[PDB]
Amino acid sequence: DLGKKLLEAARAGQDDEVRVLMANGADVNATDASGLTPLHLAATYGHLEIVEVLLKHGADVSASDLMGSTPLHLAALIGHLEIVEVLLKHGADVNAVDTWGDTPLRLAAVMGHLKIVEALLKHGADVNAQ
Amino acid sequence: MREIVHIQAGQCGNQIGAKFWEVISDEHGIDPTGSYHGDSDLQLERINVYYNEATGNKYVPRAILVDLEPGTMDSVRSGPFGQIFRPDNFVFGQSGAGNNWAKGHYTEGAELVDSVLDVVRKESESCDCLQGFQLTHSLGGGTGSGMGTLLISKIREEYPDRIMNTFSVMPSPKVSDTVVEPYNATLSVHQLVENTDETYCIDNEALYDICFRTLKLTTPTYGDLNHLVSATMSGVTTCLRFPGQLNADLRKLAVNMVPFPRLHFFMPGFAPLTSRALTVPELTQQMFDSKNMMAACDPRHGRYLTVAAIFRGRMSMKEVDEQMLNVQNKNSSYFVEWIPNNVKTAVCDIPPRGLKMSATFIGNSTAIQELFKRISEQFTAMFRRKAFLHWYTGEGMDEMEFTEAESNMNDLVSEYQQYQDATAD
Amino acid sequence: MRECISIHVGQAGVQIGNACWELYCLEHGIQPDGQMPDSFNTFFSETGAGKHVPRAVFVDLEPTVIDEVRTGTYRQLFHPEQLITGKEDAANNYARGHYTIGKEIIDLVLDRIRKLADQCTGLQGFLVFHSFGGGTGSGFTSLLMERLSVDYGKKSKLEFSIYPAPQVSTAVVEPYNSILTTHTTLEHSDCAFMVDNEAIYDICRRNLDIERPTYTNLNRLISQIVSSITASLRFDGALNVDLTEFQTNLVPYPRIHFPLATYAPVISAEKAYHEQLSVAEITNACFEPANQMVKCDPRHGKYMACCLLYRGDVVPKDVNAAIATIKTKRSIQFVDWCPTGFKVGINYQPPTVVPGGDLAKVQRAVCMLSNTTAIAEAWARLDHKFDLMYAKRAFVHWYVGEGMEEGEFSEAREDMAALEKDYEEVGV
Ligand SMILES: Nc1nc2c(ncn2[C@@H]2O[C@H](COP(=O)(O)OP(=O)(O)OP(=O)(O)O)[C@@H](O)[C@H]2O)c(=O)[nH]1
Ligand SMILES: COc1cc2c(c(OC)c1OC)-c1ccc(OC)c(=O)cc1[C@@H](NC(C)=O)CC2
Ligand SMILES: Nc1nc2c(ncn2[C@@H]2O[C@H](COP(=O)(O)OP(=O)(O)O)[C@@H](O)[C@H]2O)c(=O)[nH]1
Ligand SMILES: [Mg+2]
């Protein structure tokens, strides 16, 4: 299954495997059992080149898993600044609210990712409203 | 003879442990070869508490050096006091723990644990009368956190009648090596609550804040943070190491400082806050100030269950007494009314290096819940999204272990709140 | 012969013991090696060489304090077998002193006591020196008192107990240890002299002008008072000649066995030449609360018994005239079932002080021993501190982890509540 293979490659940061699987018809928007897509996984695990490659070939920038987590929530939680900037530039919903009522700004602030807090606020993150 | 066995585990544990040895060796007049060269008999009176007597009037730290990362052996051995340590007391692995609590606690650490215990046993059996154990480690990594807590639980089963004391370094995003630090620290706190008699909470968040406030550092080195840790470690062990009015060991300290078994997490403090002479009222005010605490909690948000204060140097002992009682009378609301005379002061004639007067604070405060709340909130943010969970489950851990550690830390927070709101009915 | 064995338990017991034996030696003319260039044979045994050996036992659960005795000025006064030490102390925990740590040394301590008892031909009993606050002073003393009541059933047991004070190095758990030891010792003690560290601290500051008194300053004052109480046992007078008489003269109700000691005069050695105080002046000072060994208000209480023990240049008719004035000018209320009279003892030797010490040598001194209901105020102070902590079970885990049942705290407190009531019932 090409979908499962691309999810694994995006998580593991296998740049060459990602490109090879996509050339074979792999679903860029495939989901695992929890609703995580290759973009969610590349954004969580800091694979910038894969994040960029997925976005160039139809990945949904604001896809939600079963818990309402978007790739931006995950990049902000883990503290991947360059990934946060790339997602925002590609139209990620800065004010996306997950099942716990958290926004990317709230996660970046809880984890002490000050540069991401700044970047989110600059791209219209609403602090007083979730 | 009141001997203490010192253990240092992981990168942070060995770095702060080496600095403790360099600082206390200077106070006791012990050079890196183990030779004494001081001018006072008071320096050697209680030398046996931390040092073994070696051949030809030499002193050797009763210290065990542990790490899963081999490179730690080298860095300690290359330090100014590197040669003072017994070579067979270095117990080192080759693969590392990769900042993973599960690797330290169940995999690599479980494989090295017996070798450490053999060294602990050899040191313990040679003691005339073992007081207990002192462990230095961080809670944010893999070795100090995972293997350190595994070592504590094994020591607790082998030496149940001996005190277990830790100097535990709390992680902060302001000083962070990885985002898995909240998982590693939560899993460790759970173990510390159950298996240690008394823990000094050395909070990296507070160390960063002190360095920013005092030296305007936005980018401190571990050296900058460690200067505060070593000053504190020297101060809190003063009455164990030096002769004076106080006839007391670690158990007597635990008895009077710990009213509830789980609430054994101390907020250390230090004055004056220097860099790499104050009056008695100035030392006293500074010692009780939020800006001087080594745990990032506001004392004003809670109540002190118990307080110990150690003044060092030549000063008016009458002035110290008046100043200490004044703090309690003017600020009665910050001390629980249901533990009478819960603020204790000791004075030691010998000041630390490069200082004429100093004061060390040891607080058992309900405000420490702020530190546990901070870690818990970061743990929860990470755990809800299951980020990096396979690192732990891949070592055989179950997700229930995470849920259980989460609940126990939240139970600890609620216990502190219960005593903060308690009235002297 | 009528021998008395002194037992010093824990740091406070041992250190006060050091000060007492130093003063006894000076009073009886015995050198620190035991040689002398006898009524005192009640407290000192004599070898074939003429060496005078104290009938004393020193016990501690850790060795530091007793090691100072073993190497100090009086290292040749006591025999090594009389100085017993453990390796690990009781860490301010009554339960360690009584149960876990104390059980390991009790048999050895009793064996050593038995060796001294074998040297006696008419053993009167024991004088037990200890703190209320220490884990050893509290816990080990109560275990030893329990074992001595079984092994020496007919023997009298008196205590000199160091009552805790915040001004004098107390610890947070000391109110617990005080109540725990009081409960378990109550039925095993015939008479107990409480020494409140705050009263001694106050006297040293006010009368000796010592801003921050050391244990040496406090203990030299305590030994001066203890010597005044035991003089009758060492000089063969007419009042309190045997241990049994202390109970007969001061204790009409067995549980209410805590007499208030009041001492005068306490004069600084480093103060300008003053006209010596008369019998009337030192007697008047016995009713001054500032001179008491225990802080309490005797005007709030009632007297059950009263003994006046004079030493030095004291004429009996001058004492009788002083007492007559006291029954007039002052309001001394006795309980309706007690004789109302004051028992008088006079020892004619000039009072003795440590040479170079803080206390000035006086021509005449007096210790008044009064059994007053006012001393219940000292029990109420301890009970209040106990209550605050116990309501939250603060520190209780330390005791439970050291061979003690939690229920023992409740049983001890209930006994203290009954004791406070005993005082209240007599006080009306
Ligand atoms: N007056 C007086 N009080 C003392 C002396 N030493 C200790 N104390 C008091 O005794 C109490 C502490 O008890 P200690 O006797 O020192 O302790 P311990 O009996 O040896 O027992 P542990 O150390 O707990 O095993 C406190 O209230 C002290 O102020 C002394 O030499 N004189
Ligand atoms: C070995 O070092 C220490 C050991 C202890 C104490 C202490 O603080 C002054 C120490 O220095 C840090 C101590 C602490 C707190 C107390 O009350 C909160 C107390 O009652 C009592 C104490 C100590 N006792 C006294 C009279 O200070 C005994 C235990
Ligand atoms: N204060 C202080 N913190 C340190 C030091 N070295 C590492 N840390 C902290 O310790 C945590 C990482 O654990 P570490 O000890 O390096 O890993 P281990 O070797 O697996 O135990 C993080 O919170 C670091 O900030 C040090 O020398 N001092
Ligand atoms: Mg002691």
Domains with residue ranges and CATH for chain B: 1-259 (3.40.50.1440), 260-367 (3.30.1330.20), 368-425 (1.10.287.600)
**Of residues C22, C245, C377, C402, which has the active-site annotation?**
C245
What residues make up the domain containing C186? 1-259
Q: Are strands C56-60 and C4-9 parallel, antiparallel or unpaired?
A: parallel
Instruction: Report yes or no: C380 at the B interface, CB cutoff 8 Å.
Output: no
Beta bridge partners of B53: B59
Supply A54's token pair. 């997925």
Three-state DSSP state, C159: strand
B143 backbone dihedrals φ, ψ, rounded to 5°: -70, -65
Instruction: Report yes or no: C99 at the B interface, CB cutoff 8 Å.
Output: no
Q: Hey, CA dihedral for C191, C196, C201, C203, is it positive or negative?
A: negative
Name which of C296, C216, C223 is nearest C260 in CA terms: C296
Residue C334 and residue C193 in one domain: no
How many angstroms separate the alpha carbon of residue B386 from the centre of ligand 2? 44
CATH number for the domain harbouring residue C318 = 3.30.1330.20
Residue C246 and residue C325 in one domain: no
Distance CA A17, CA A10 (A): 9
Provide DSSP, B322-364: HHHHHHHHHTGGGB-TTSTT-EEEEEES-PPTT-SEEEEEEEE
Structural domains in chain C (count): 3
Q: Taking CB atoms and an 8 Å cutoff, what residues of chain B touch A67?
A: 384-385
Q: Are strands B304-313 and C343-347 parallel, antiparallel or unpaired?
A: unpaired
Residue C63 and residue C209 in one domain: yes
Beta bridge partners of A109: none
Pinpoint the alpha helices (H) of B237-279: 238-241, 250-257
Last residue of a domain, one of C205, C239, C259: C259
Best of C66, C104, C383, C395 to disrupt the B interface (most B CBs within 10 Å) is C395
Q: Are strands C303-312 and C343-347 parallel, antiparallel or unpaired?
A: parallel
Residue B179 DSSP one-character state: T
Supply C145's token pair. 């008192």
**Percentage helix, strand, coil for chain B under 3-state DSSP, each rounded to 5:** 50, 20, 30
CB atoms within 10 A of CB B35: 13
Residue C47 and residue C185 in one domain: yes
Provide DSSP, B7-72: EEEHHHHHHHHHHHHHHHHHHHTB-TTSBB--S-GGGTTTGGGTEEEETTTEEEE-EEEEESSTHH
Residue C105 and residue C209 in one domain: yes
Distance CA B216, CA B220 (A): 9
- Burial (CB < 10 A; 0-12, 13-18, 19+), residue A129, is exposed
Up-side HSE of residue C253: CA atoms within 13 Å toward CB? 19
Task: List the resolution, Å.
Answer: 1.9
Three-state DSSP state, C50: coil
Q: C316 preceded by cis ω (within 30°)?
A: no
Annotated active-site residue C424? The verdict is: no
CATH number for the domain harbouring residue C32 = 3.40.50.1440
Name which of C366, C240, C243, C241 is nearest C305 in CA terms: C240
Residue C172 and residue C58 in one domain: yes
Cβ distance B340 to C175 less than 8 Å, yes or no, reads yes
Residue C221 and residue C123 in one domain: yes
Name which of B402, B370, B397 is nearest B386 in CA terms: B402
C411 backbone dihedrals φ, ψ, rounded to 5°: -60, -40
Q: Quick one: how far is CA B327 from the chain centroid?
A: 26
Q: Which helix (H) or strand (E) holds B136?
A: strand B130-138
User: Which own/partner pairs from C149-153 qualify as long-range (CB within 8 Å, at least 24 positions apart)?
Assistant: C149/C187, C149/C188, C151/C110, C151/C114, C152/C117, C152/C123, C152/C125, C152/C126
Last residue of a domain, one of C259, C283, C302: C259
Cβ distance B173 to A102 less than 8 Å, yes or no, reads no
Radius of gyration of chain B (CA): 21
| Number of A–B residue contacts, CB under 8 Å | 33
Q: Are strands C83-85 and C56-60 parallel, antiparallel or unpaired?
A: parallel
Distance CA C251, CA C245 (A): 9
Chain A residues within 8 Å of chain B (Cβ atoms): 34, 44, 67, 69, 73-74, 77-79, 100, 102, 107, 110-113
Instruction: Report yes or no: B344 at the C interface, CB cutoff 8 Å.
Output: yes
Ligand closest to Cα of B251 equals: 2
Cβ distance B128 to C172 less than 8 Å, yes or no, reads no
Max CA-CA distance within chain A? 46
Q: What is the residue whose two structure tokens read 């008999």?
A: B41
Supply C290's token pair. 């500032």
Map out the domains of chain A with their CATH numbers: 1-130 (1.25.40.20)
Three-state DSSP state, B3: strand
Supply B421's token pair. 């709101």
Cβ distance B337 to C389 less than 8 Å, yes or no, reads no
How many angstroms separate the alpha carbon of residue B384 from the centre of ligand 4? 52
Of C87, C88, C92, the CB nearest to B256: C92
Instruction: Yes or no: say if B206 and B175 are a contact pair by the CB < 8 Å rule.
Output: no
CATH number for the domain harbouring residue C406 = 1.10.287.600
CB atoms within 10 A of CB B391: 18
Distance CA C193, CA C176 (A): 19
Distance CA C256, CA C193 (A): 12
Instruction: Yes or no: say if B186 and B219 are a contact pair by the CB < 8 Å rule.
Output: no
Q: Which atom of ligand 1 is nearest to the CA of C96?
A: 25
Residue C131 and residue C264 in one domain: no
Three-state DSSP state, B425: coil
Distance CA A119, CA A85 (A): 7
Residue C275 and residue C236 in one domain: no
Neighbours of chain C (3+ CB pairs under 8 A): B
Q: Which helix (H) or strand (E) holds B188?
A: helix B181-195
Cβ distance A110 to B378 less than 8 Å, yes or no, reads yes
CB atoms within 10 A of CB B101: 36
Instruction: Yes or no: say if A36 and A7 are a contact pair by the CB < 8 Å rule.
Output: yes
- Burial (CB < 10 A; 0-12, 13-18, 19+), residue B273, is middle
Residue C360 and residue C387 in one domain: no
Supply C71's token pair. 């190497």
Distance CA C263, CA B65 (A): 60
Q: How far is CA B160 from CA A67, B138, C229, in A?
A: 46, 24, 46
Max CA-CA distance within chain B? 61
Residue C59 DSSP one-character state: E
Of C65, C87, C172, the CB nearest to B306: C172
Name which of C18, C6, C388, C16 is nearest C197 in CA terms: C16
Q: B272 preceded by cis ω (within 30°)?
A: yes
Distance CA C342, CA B24 (A): 62
Beta bridge partners of B304: B335, B365
Residue C354 and residue C389 in one domain: no
Distance CA B367, CA C128 (A): 45
Residue C367 and residue C248 in one domain: no
Given strand C343-347, what is the order of strands in its sheet? C260-264, C364-372, C303-312, C343-347
